[PDB]
């Protein structure tokens, strides 16, 4: 008998139970947490350039693994019942590496480089990164708040694509 897990999700009793089953099967060494190796052992994930970003966002306490609460809370970002602002904040978090609430020039470059690879020259990438920030930076601190981020991408309706069945 242990103390209750406490969390914030869109999921009901049934769904949490089903997510719990996937968690245990994914938990190879059965330690109660999910390591990078355990995620990477799924073949379909090995050539995904974004796996680590997702894990870093799920890992909210910061210890490098994903426990059941953070697993539930992470998946819930993708619930069919999630609002637009929630799906956008998740996409925002992909670019916001240090989680300080802003997107810096350096971060934007790094996350793009991660996805673009060697398609663009570094110089080219740096310039469209410069121009993207300068255009969206309403208050001139040189970075991109969430409110500014939404102003740019809010009309793209990508949030309709970020949905999973549980």
């Amino acid at each position: 008998a242990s103390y209750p897990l406490e969390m914030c999700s869109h999921f009901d009793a049934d769904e949490i139970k089903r997510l719990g089953k996937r968690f245990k099967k994914l938990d190879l060494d059965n330690s109660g947490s999910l390591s990078v190796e355990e995620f990477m052992s799924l073949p379909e994930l090995q050539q995904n350039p974004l796996v680590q970003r997702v894990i870093d966002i799920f890992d909210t306490d910061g210890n490098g693994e994903v426990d059941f609460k953070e697993f539930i809370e992470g998946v819930s970002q993708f619930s069919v019942k999630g609002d637009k602002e929630q799906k956008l904040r998740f996409a925002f978090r992909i670019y916001d590496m240090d989680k300080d609430g802003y997107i810096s020039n350096g971060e934007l470059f790094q996350v793009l480089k991660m996805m673009v690879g060697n398609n663009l020259k570094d110089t080219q990438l740096q310039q469209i990164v410069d121009k993207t920030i300068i255009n969206a930076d309403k208050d001139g601190d040189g970075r991109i708040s969430f409110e500014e981020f939404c102003a740019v991408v809010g009309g793209l309706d990508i949030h309709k694509k970020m949905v999973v069945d549980v």
Partner: protein, 397 residues
């Protein structure tokens, strides 16, 4: 509290020049007399700077005001520097003025096509219109086939205004474009137009009486002036036909050597100078006429390394002291833009959305009712000319 970190504290490629973060204000651009400061404007634009939208309108409208006053067929005398298509290549336009000479002590005639294709069209317009305001009687601008609603909606120039400035500026440009002269009679001996001749245009008077303040129609004299080309076999004709339907453009005509000879003789003209068509040397001198020993037709093309892929030279035509001299020049570096001016968020977000959702679906499918592109991607002369024939055509409807 601390200040935010200096913005380039974590910029990865530090050597790359960072654009200005402020738009030029009206006080910075316009002097006491309401006259533009052209060197301030240039230095800002070279850095990829932008101006207050109210200034963009003010520049474009004053330019339009001046152009509207002008004859449909202006008359300009030597000495003069004649330039062909520019196509939004601002960093090459800079080079062109270094090659042809300062607009302050040099007479210029531009045959059109200031926008589309290159991603610095609005800067070209702004800079050229400022020169027109400063030197209304020594700098001249004709209309090319791209200065119209039809082509700018289809190509990138409408997007460019919407992204960098606004719809209002785009609109003000369309009215300024309607103001542009269609042709120039140069030194009473060359007719200068963007495209060429028309089966419905036989005298200079037929040009003089054209009503130009409108979108170019899909057929007719005005359309032809902007759209026609010499035939592919100019000066060495199989058929003796004067005009034929222009298969390449999808509108207007090809004109051939006899068509030009007739028009040159019926109007007492030495030759026809025009643009509109890419050239490896940045110019072309067509078959000389027997009567004069002078090239009947000249193409002049002022956008080097067209579309970053042609590797062509550019040229301007310098006409002084009874010598026509062709100044050639190569390209110059220019900053990068994603196709259609998309920011890296709009560009990447879809990929992000697809790949994280893909990951979660693959993760969640670990149990299968036992519960009872891999990389983002950016969107010589004869080779790049055949990959671009579809784009030298009049967009349908």
């Amino acid at each position: 509290p601390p200040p935010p970190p200096p913005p380039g504290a974590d910029r990865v490629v530090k050597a790359v020049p960072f654009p200005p973060t402020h738009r030029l204000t009206s006080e910075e651009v316009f002097d006491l007399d309401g006259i533009p400061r052209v060197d301030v404007l240039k230095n800002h634009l070279v850095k990829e700077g932008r101006v207050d939208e109210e200034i963009a309108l003010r520049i474009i409208n004053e330019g339009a005001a001046i152009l509207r006053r002008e004859k449909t067929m202006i008359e300009v005398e030597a000495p003069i520097t004649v330039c062909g298509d520019i196509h939004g290549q601002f960093f090459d336009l800079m080079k062109l003025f270094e090659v042809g000479g300062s607009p302050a002590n040099t007479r210029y005639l531009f045959l059109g096509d200031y926008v589309d294709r290159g991603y610095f069209s609005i800067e070209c317009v702004l800079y050229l219109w400022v020169l027109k305001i400063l030197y209304p009687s020594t700098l001249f601008l004709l209309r090319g086939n791209h200065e119209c609603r039809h082509l700018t909606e289809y190509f990138t120039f409408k997007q460019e205004c919407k992204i960098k400035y606004s719809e209002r500026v785009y609109e003000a440009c369309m009215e300024a474009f309607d103001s542009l002269p269609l042709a120039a009679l140069l030194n009473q001996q060359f007719l200068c137009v963007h495209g060429g001749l028309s089966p419905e245009i036989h005298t200079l008077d037929d040009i003089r009486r054209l009503d130009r303040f409108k979108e170019p129609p899909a057929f007719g004299p005005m359309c032809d002036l902007l759209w026609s080309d010499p035939s592919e076999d100019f000066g060495n004709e199989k058929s003796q036909e004067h005009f034929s339907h222009n298969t390449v453009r999808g509108c207007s005509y090809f004109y051939n050597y006899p068509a030009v000879c007739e028009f040159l003789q019926n109007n007492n003209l030495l030759s026809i100078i025009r643009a509109h068509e890419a050239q490896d040397a940045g110019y072309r001198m067509y078959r000389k006429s027997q009567t004069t020993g002078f090239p009947s037709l000249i193409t002049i093309f002022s956008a080097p390394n067209y579309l970053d892929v042609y590797n062509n030279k550019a040229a301007v035509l310098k006409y002084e002291n009874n010598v026509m001299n062709i100044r050639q020049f190569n390209c110059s570096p220019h900053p990068y833009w994603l196709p259609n001016f998309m920011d890296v968020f709009t560009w990447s977000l879809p990929f992000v959305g697809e790949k994280v959702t893909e990951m979660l679906v693959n993760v969640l499918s670990i149990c299968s009712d036992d519960e009872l592109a891999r990389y983002l991607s950016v969107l010589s002369f004869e080779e790049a000319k055949g990959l671009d024939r579809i784009n030298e055509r009049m967009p349908p409807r």
